[PDB]
Design a binder for this molecule. Structure first.
Ligand SMILES: Cn1c(=O)ccc2cc(Nc3ccnc(Cl)c3C#N)ccc21
Ligand SMILES: Cn1c(=O)ccc2cc(Nc3ccnc(Cl)c3C#N)ccc21
Ligand SMILES: [Cl-]
Ligand SMILES: [Cl-]
Lengths: 5, 125, 125, 5
């Protein structure tokens, strides 16, 4: 996996 | 919202699962006929990859067809390669098939594939 | 073949186009009902994202249903957030919705979402 | 974009 897009 | 988190692998995982449904013939809703060959697929995936299929399946009459016959000049192997690319992001481009793949991608309106085919041809000139 | 080239953005472009079809209500083939709320979607996308929908739409009777009613304990906003995640890879996770999103993801069998929800909850403890 | 996967 999860990220800040 | 602009506060979302994103799962990086989600789009590729969805595509892998759509290809697994295709392999297993689960909820396929159209047969594309290319000369003597038949290919089962999902209309939504075809529309999501090809300008020609987007136009076909948004037409108020053709959206209901369960069989679509392509122009007899289209090469079945070229179509098979492009259908696999639609469902996997991978294009099996080879010296022996590049002209057929490019002609099929032009017909299917898949610009990115037409682009890489032109580049590979130009490099061999 | 092991000689393929790959278009990096293909899977995300397909998903963006599937979400555009959903927005435009093009070839949606199921309505998911969650208490008073209705959500139109494509069965293949639901199956590609959720173990529960994969089981539902591979069943020889339920594969033909055009309406699926979820358990009345499922929160419609939680479902809406998860449906948007299915079609975009982005999860609108907030303090006010995390418990509903986690409970809905457990029911829908979406392990990666359940994982990030557990992590965010544990961080606030 | 195109790459060798
Ligand atoms: C010209 N062209 C390419 O060169 C490549 C891929 C490609 C894919 C589509 N498909 C869509 C386009 C816009 N909006 C929607 Cl909803 C869809 C769908 N489904 C159309 C044209 C394309
Ligand atoms: C448990 N689980 C998650 O936790 C997340 C996502 C998820 C997605 C599926 N879907 C498939 C799995 C395997 N083969 C196919 Cl063809 C599909 C489809 N369509 C199933 C279980 C899942
Ligand atoms: Cl393309
Ligand atoms: Cl998930």
């Amino acid at each position: 996996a999860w990220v800040i897009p | 919202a602009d506060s979302c988190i994103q799962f990086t692998r989600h789009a590729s995982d969805v595509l892998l699962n759509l290809n697994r449904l295709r392999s297993r013939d689960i909820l396929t809703d159209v047969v594309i006929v290319v000369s003597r060959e038949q290919f089962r697929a999902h209309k939504t995936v075809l529309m999501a990859c090809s300008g020609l299929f987007y136009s076909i399946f948004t037409d108020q009459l053709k959206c209901n067809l369960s069989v679509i016959n392509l122009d007899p000049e289209i090469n079945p192997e070229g179509f098979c390669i492009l259908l696999d690319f639609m469902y996997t992001s991978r294009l099996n481009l080879r010296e022996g098939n590049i002209m057929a793949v490019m002609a099929t991608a032009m017909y299917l309106q898949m610009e990115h594939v037409v682009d890489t085919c032109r580049k590979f041809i130009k490099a061999s000139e």
